[PDB]
Amino acid sequence: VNSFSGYLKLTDNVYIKNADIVEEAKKVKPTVVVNAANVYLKHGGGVAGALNKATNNAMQVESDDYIATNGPLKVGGSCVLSGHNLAKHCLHVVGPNVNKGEDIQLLKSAYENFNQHEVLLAPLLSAGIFGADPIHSLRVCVDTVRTNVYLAVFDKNLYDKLVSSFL
Ligand SMILES: CCC(CC)(CO)Nc1ncnc2[nH]ccc12
């Protein structure tokens, strides 16, 4: 039993809700919140910009030190950093950005990072400003993640379409 509330159960391990991931994290304080990161950990917009804003830019400060030490992530890769006031940890995961021409096949690799954590609060990878089809992202999530994932979909209209079209 966990404290995630109001989710629709899609499969044995995948759950979904129309919610703002920032407000969900602040309520649940999960062990792991997933950020829709880029390889430079520049949290300017989308989910990343919203999470970073909620940390009063502490996420960005920590991220800049991470990059200065380690260099950029790989597309499809991840790193674990602090969750600041939102969660114990933040798993920064880089899905491909279609608006940069990046290979969509890397979306499966991106979701594989979730399997290193027993329970996660997450967005749909490569959705929103990353330019991929959120329906496809949900399919890859369900077919790749084996640990317990709670998906927050900000747009109410998109959520209803994801639910209604889910096979
Ligand atoms: C902008 C698209 C979407 C769904 C509304 C997923 O790709 N992005 C988010 N999904 C969950 N929580 C969010 N908070 C701020 C943005 C955001």
CATH fit for domain 8-163, picks 3.40.220.10, 3.90.550.10, 3.40.50.300, 3.30.1390.20: 3.40.220.10
For ligand 1, the distance from its centroid to the CA atom of residue 154, given in whole angstroms, is 4
**Ligand 1 surroundings by CB, under 6 angstroms:** 20-22, 46-47, 50, 123-124, 127-128, 134, 152-155
Method used to determine the 3D structure: X-ray
CA dihedral (150, 155, 159, 165) in degrees, to 10, reads -130
Find the helix packing angle between 46-54 and 21-28, rounded to 10°: 40
For ligand 1, the distance from its centroid to the CA atom of residue 74, given in whole angstroms, is 22
Q: Which helix (H) or strand (E) holds 9?
A: strand 8-9
Cα-Cα-Cα-Cα dihedral sign, residues 112, 165, 97, 53? negative
Cα(128)–Cα(121) distance, integer angstroms: 17
Cα(79)–Cα(51) distance, integer angstroms: 16
- The reported resolution of this PDB entry, expressed in Å, is 1.0
> In Å, what is the CA distance from 150 to each residue of 19, 76, 114?
11, 20, 11
For ligand 1, the distance from its centroid to the CA atom of residue 62, given in whole angstroms, is 22
For ligand 1, the distance from its centroid to the CA atom of residue 125, given in whole angstroms, is 10
